[PDB]
Ligand binder design. Sequence first.
Ligand SMILES: [Zn+2]
Ligand SMILES: [Zn+2]
Length: 125
Amino acid sequence: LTPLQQAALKWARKLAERFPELGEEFIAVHLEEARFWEKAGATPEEVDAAGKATLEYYEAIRNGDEEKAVEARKKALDIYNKIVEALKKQPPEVVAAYEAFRPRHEALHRRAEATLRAQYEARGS
Ligand SMILES: [Zn+2]
Ligand SMILES: [Zn+2]
């Protein structure tokens, strides 16, 4: 267990615990994403800051806080953009592997956004 994997595990487990509908699948998908971040040369602190902003982002959707959602989304994607451009210099098998994995992360992301917005519209928070 690398320090980068531990950093991704900490924030992905928090999201799964607070929103059980996402489930352990939310943790596993974010670990696989973290393996590509590690391949691209990301550091544990970059993954820790991005995971922290991701929890704040989804917590913002659950609570209807739009300003916090905008700020948290930018903080997470500022770090993600650094890693997309680093992935360009990766071997083609790594890039092709990432392009084949990303639709599964996209589908979990679409589900998580809709499910938490639904909890704000119904439960209210
Ligand atoms: Zn995600
Ligand atoms: Zn989105």
